[PDB]
Amino acid sequence: PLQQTGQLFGGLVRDIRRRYPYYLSDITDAFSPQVLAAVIFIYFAALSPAITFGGLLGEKTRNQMGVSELLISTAVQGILFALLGAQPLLVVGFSGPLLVFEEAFFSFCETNGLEYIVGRVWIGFWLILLVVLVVAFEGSFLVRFISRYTQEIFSFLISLIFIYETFSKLIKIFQDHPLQKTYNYNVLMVPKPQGPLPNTALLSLVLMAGTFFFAMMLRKFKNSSYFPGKLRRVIGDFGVPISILIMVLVDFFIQDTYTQKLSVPDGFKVSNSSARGWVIHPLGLRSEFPIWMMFASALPALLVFILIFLESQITTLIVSKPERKMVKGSGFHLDLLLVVGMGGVAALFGMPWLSATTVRSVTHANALTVMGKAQIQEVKEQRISGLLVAVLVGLSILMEPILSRIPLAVLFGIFLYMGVTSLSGIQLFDRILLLFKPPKYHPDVPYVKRVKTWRMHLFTGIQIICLAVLWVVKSTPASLALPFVLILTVPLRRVLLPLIFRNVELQCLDADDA
Amino acid sequence: VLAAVIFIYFAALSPAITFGGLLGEKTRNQMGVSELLISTAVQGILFALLGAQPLLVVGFSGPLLVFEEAFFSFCETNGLEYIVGRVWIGFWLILLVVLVVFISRYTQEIFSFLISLIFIYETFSKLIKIFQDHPLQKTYNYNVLMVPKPQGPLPNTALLSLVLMAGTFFFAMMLRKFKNSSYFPGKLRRVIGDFGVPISILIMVLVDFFIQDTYTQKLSVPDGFKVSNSSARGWVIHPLGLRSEFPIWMMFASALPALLVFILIFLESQITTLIFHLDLLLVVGMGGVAALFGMPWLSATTVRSVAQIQEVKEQRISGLLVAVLVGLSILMEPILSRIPLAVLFGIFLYMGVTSLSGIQLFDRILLLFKPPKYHPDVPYVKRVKTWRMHLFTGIQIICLAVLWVVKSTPASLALPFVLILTVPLRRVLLPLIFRNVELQCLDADD
Ligand SMILES: CCCCCCCC(=O)OC[C@H](COP(=O)(O)O[C@@H]1[C@H](O)[C@H](O)[C@@H](OP(=O)(O)O)[C@H](OP(=O)(O)O)[C@H]1O)OC(=O)CCCCCCC
Ligand SMILES: CCCCCCCC(=O)OC[C@H](COP(=O)(O)O[C@@H]1[C@H](O)[C@H](O)[C@@H](OP(=O)(O)O)[C@H](OP(=O)(O)O)[C@H]1O)OC(=O)CCCCCCC
Ligand SMILES: CCCCCCCCCCCC(=O)OC[C@H](COP(=O)(O)OCC[N+](C)(C)C)OC(=O)CCCCCCCCCCC
Ligand SMILES: CCCCCCCCCCCC(=O)OC[C@H](COP(=O)(O)OCC[N+](C)(C)C)OC(=O)CCCCCCCCCCC
Ligand SMILES: CCCCCCCCCCCC(=O)OC[C@H](COP(=O)(O)OCC[N+](C)(C)C)OC(=O)CCCCCCCCCCC
Ligand SMILES: CCCCCCCCCCCC(=O)OC[C@H](COP(=O)(O)OCC[N+](C)(C)C)OC(=O)CCCCCCCCCCC
Ligand SMILES: *[C@@H]1O[C@H](CO[C@@H]2O[C@@H](C)[C@@H](O)[C@@H](O)[C@@H]2O)[C@@H](O[C@@H]2O[C@H](CO)[C@@H](O)[C@H](O)[C@H]2NC(C)=O)[C@H](O)[C@H]1NC(C)=O
Ligand SMILES: *[C@@H]1O[C@H](CO[C@@H]2O[C@@H](C)[C@@H](O)[C@@H](O)[C@@H]2O)[C@@H](O[C@@H]2O[C@H](CO)[C@@H](O)[C@H](O)[C@H]2NC(C)=O)[C@H](O)[C@H]1NC(C)=O
């Protein structure tokens, strides 16, 4: 799949030929309760980031790109990707790096007196050209140089960021509504409460903790000996939806305390009608777009392409591992072409360009994974779950009566569950756990029996240093340099690490398969 | 010697303060943390100096708490003075001991399972009561006075109590798991898990201590070697009454509660000590004498978690030191007054949940929900039909339901008699329903 055929668009045609013969099975394998449970789970997992990032985007760009734009982008691009993608289990949506770039480019346009929504159009043009060139010459073969080292550093960092951000949201709730002796019990609640409210922070904490606990307990019950096997598996596959329902009902019967609920736009409208309309004129809206910027849009285009390419391709590598028991194949070239070209086209309508996100895609793949009776029997690979998730995200503006009843703390508990369950299957996390167990309890794995304990710990420590560096870079005003700092783990593995470790240790600690 | 003494001291102190808090809350501090601590100390010193088996641990238990609550409820119903009725029960206990001077896994496990259920149910009931005192409301009155206790609902009190209870229970459970996990050096892991309950109490007490604005009810502890409620009573209880004359008819009917208390203490000795008689006589006599001073009667219990002359002397000094420290723990009133009752509720739930482990009735109740292919390789699974074992478990569950109904009614004082009625049930009716092989598998001494 990552070989170079020497022909123009050879990898793309190979991906299409390999995956499209499976289309009827991609439709029919969706007929299972597990697929429906995964649809509900991933629908919440995909809607909540869209709303959060759309709110932040509207705040940071003055509603030139807001919540409705991101919802429409996610829905349409997810539908097209589920219909035409070589790896239908990838979930394409907004991410933190994309928001950071949008902020930086909006700042640049404001400083230089340019229209931000037209500079985005030209960035999209350049993204289309660049991805077409990369797929013509099969540049996705470079993905073969990203080994388990980089894949697992990236996955662990993303999971840690997920968990940290949900906890920071909870801490923010506690900061807005601190526990006080007295309150101004007639606080105004529009648009959001203007002052501290009693019981709000503790109730949010309780709701998050209860959702997390019920999800984890139903996960345990799925793999337990209780109840008939089929009913047990069905109930445990609906574990996350059941926990969400339980906690939403708990919140529904407490009418006196305030908790923040999901908010969606009132309709399918642009966030700022005065700023721009549905279709962006590339030559400008209220002023002529400069030619020098028409050409200089190639560097922001290169940065955006690097971000999207790295994120999506590492996600594809993670979900397509041989251990996970995927058998229908994955197309790096086709998926890259689809995602980047769709983002470039969406820039022409003012919508965000998206990326195959790591935690969401891994959660989607795990929700479709069938556990054999501590082993992975198979994965329900099909195009219906992602299609239905994208359709539901595109219909969320019409689902206000239901979504307005769902607290954000329940979804925080679900996000904590996603973050913790995404750590499974990552050998870096296993080796981090081994740092605390005595050597006599270390598992029977090649890197435990073939590598001395202190050398394996040193390997894990170098990886932890890489993680710390990445976290610091992400926390600084140089956050946009993260993709390059992560790319630096490839030369670190292929050049620096051989100077420390021996070949046998490096093959044991960085094996292609487990 | 010192490490074991510290471990035993904390193992004695945690249940002591938990039960003292519950008992002081129920009885309006007629008996509370101070009385329980002083009784434990004095009776432990006496048992370390005189008790034939110095390895036995004498202290308050869940059955004793249940009986104390039932007797307080009965005295409230009949307008009697509870602390004087206790004195006459103690007189009768002493008389019974002077007069004196069969229990199978069936009865023992029904008893322990009932106590566990009571602990869990009482924890949740206390939390519900807290939520009733301080409902979640849009608005509150900030002029609420707090001299005896909050006179109206307060914000964050019920939710914070729930959080403290849940956190204490979760930390105790997590440290219990960590005790037997593969993490950290074995010695440090086992030491940390040994003191798991104290550590969880400390963590949640600190959490509550650094939250200063919200109110949570705390332990009621006097300053010094004093009674929990001086206005209600003093140290010496005059048998004829403190505020009202004590009825003579009750002076004679105190023999029945005395018999029930004797049954409970003997049952606890059988469950723990057996799994001897003079030690039980000493404990019952000491409890009867302690009732004269308004202090709880205790019960001896095994599983202290430990040339012949030297060994006995060493464990006699261990009990003497632990009892002296438990008596001096009332001087740690600055620390004890900072312990929220929700933390102790979490510890109560932890005790109830963790005592379920090792009960074959609980294991068979779990098997009720498992497919037969998943049933373990135990004699009552392989030598008994699945439905016969399930019928055995169901009859035991019916016993539990009858005991719960009795505990719920005004006749809850007679609960020990209904418990002892499971001995005739095991010996008479069960042989009619079941075969000897099934009774040997389902009710075994090992
Ligand atoms: C709503 C449930 C009603 C019961 C279901 C209605 C049907 C019913 O009567 O179930 C009886 C069931 C035993 O199930 P049963 O023996 O018929 O079949 C077993 C099991 O149910 C699965 O079929 C297989 O185990 P798994 O696939 O590896 O797991 C295995 O079949 P196979 O491997 O040979 O092919 C069998 O061992 O016993 C309970 O679990 C108690 C119910 C829980 C308590 C429920 C009441 C509180
Ligand atoms: C607060 C921690 C302070 C650590 C202080 C000092 C920590 C420290 O000294 O490290 C050595 C230790 C290895 O100990 P080591 O291998 O020598 O000894 C093993 C094990 O630790 C127990 O001693 C025994 O296992 P168990 O009895 O059957 O359970 C067994 O000894 P035995 O069977 O032959 O008798 C041995 O297998 O490493 C860690 O386990 C975690 C490190 C801590 C993790 C990193 C902590 C940041
Ligand atoms: C497991 C036990 C959890 C117990 C939680 C106790 C909450 C403590 C609240 C302190 C007072 C307050 O809420 O204050 C709000 C403060 C912000 O400070 P401030 O009020 O704006 O100003 C300072 C005013 N002081 C100095 C008077 C306070 O936010 C916080 O930093 C608290 C964040 C709590 C995060 C909860 C993490 C839960 C972990 C479990 C995850 C499932
Ligand atoms: C996530 C936060 C991480 C920090 C918390 C974990 C602490 C781990 C330290 C105890 C491990 C242990 O005790 O392992 C026991 C092993 C025993 O193996 P040995 O071959 O006999 O040792 C040979 C002794 N040398 C090394 C002197 C030759 O000793 C070790 O050499 C531990 C590995 C030390 C190398 C550096 C490890 C990476 C540092 C931690 C990651 C930043
Ligand atoms: C860990 C599992 C915990 C389960 C136990 C929870 C106990 C709650 C008992 C409430 C009943 C009650 O007491 O209701 C009290 C008030 C009614 O107030 P009122 O109508 O003004 O009447 C005034 C008083 N009365 C009724 C005597 C007249 O209602 C409430 O605000 C309760 C809110 C319940 C939220 C509980 C949190 C849910 C957590 C879910 C698991 C994470
Ligand atoms: C905790 C509150 C009680 C709730 C109990 C809910 C679980 C009920 C199902 C148990 C497992 C099961 O299904 O039992 C199945 C057993 C197995 O029979 P077998 O012929 O040996 O199996 C071999 C052939 N099979 C598999 C085709 C049947 O047969 C029974 O029906 C047991 C019922 C006995 C009656 C007394 C039950 C008492 C239960 C407690 C009520 C007071
Ligand atoms: C919604 O947009 C208005 C208008 O934005 C301005 O006009 C557009 C046509 C486009 O050229 C934008 O870049 C302009 O900023 C926002 O109101 C503007 O606020 C900025 C900052 O204070 C100010 O420079 C503009 O003059 C304002 N324009 C007007 C007409 O008041 C408004 O903030 C946006 N809404 C939200 C919620 O952010
Ligand atoms: C301390 O005790 C007082 C008084 O108890 C009295 O004496 C006992 C021996 C017994 O006869 C009781 O029934 C007597 O009440 C408690 O005061 C009572 O408090 C409750 C609860 O607030 C109230 O309903 C009663 O009316 C009060 N009775 C009197 C006579 O004042 C007091 O609560 C106890 N203190 C604590 C901290 O628990």
Numbering used by the authors:
A (entry chain C): 371 to 743, 751 to 891
B (entry chain A): 405 to 505, 515 to 688, 702 to 732, 751 to 890
Could you give the paper's own sentences about this structure?
Anion Exchanger 1 (AE1) is an elevator-type transporter that plays a key role in acid-base homeostasis of erythrocytes. AE1 mediates an electroneutral anion exchange by counter-transporting one Cl– ion against one HCO3– during its transport cycle. Human AE1 contains 911 residues which are divided into two domains: an N-terminal cytosolic domain (CD, residues 1–347) and a C-terminal transmembrane domain (TMD, residues 371–911), joined by a flexible linker (residues 348–370). Similar to other facilitated transporters from the SLC4 family, e.g., the human electrogenic Na+/HCO3– cotransporter 1 (NBCe1) and the fungal borate transporter Bor1, AE1 operates via an elevator mechanism, in which the transporter switches between the inward-facing (IF) and outward-facing (OF) states by an elevator-like motion of the TD relative to SD.
Multiple different configurations of the AE1 dimer were separated by 3D classification, of which three major configurations were refined to high resolution: IF1/OF at 2.4 Å, OF/OF at 3.1 Å, and IF1/IF2 at 2.9 Å resolution. Analysis of different states within the same AE1 dimer clearly demonstrates that the two subunits function independently. In the OF state, TM10 is well-ordered, with R730 facing the extracellular space. In the predominant IF state, IF1, TM10 is completely unfolded, with R730 inaccessible to the putative substrate pathway. In the IF1 state, TM10 is unfolded and the putative substrate-binding residues fail to form a well-defined binding site; our simulations also show that anions merely remain near the intracellular vestibule. Extra densities that correspond to phosphatidylcholine (PC) lipids (used for the nanodisc reconstitution) were modeled in the structure. We also modeled two PIP2 lipids at the interface of the two AE1 subunits. Based on the distinctive shape of the densities, we have assigned them as PIP210. In the OF state, K743 in this hairpin forms a salt bridge with the 4- or 5-phosphate groups in the PIP2 headgroup, resulting in its structural stability throughout the 1 µs simulation time.
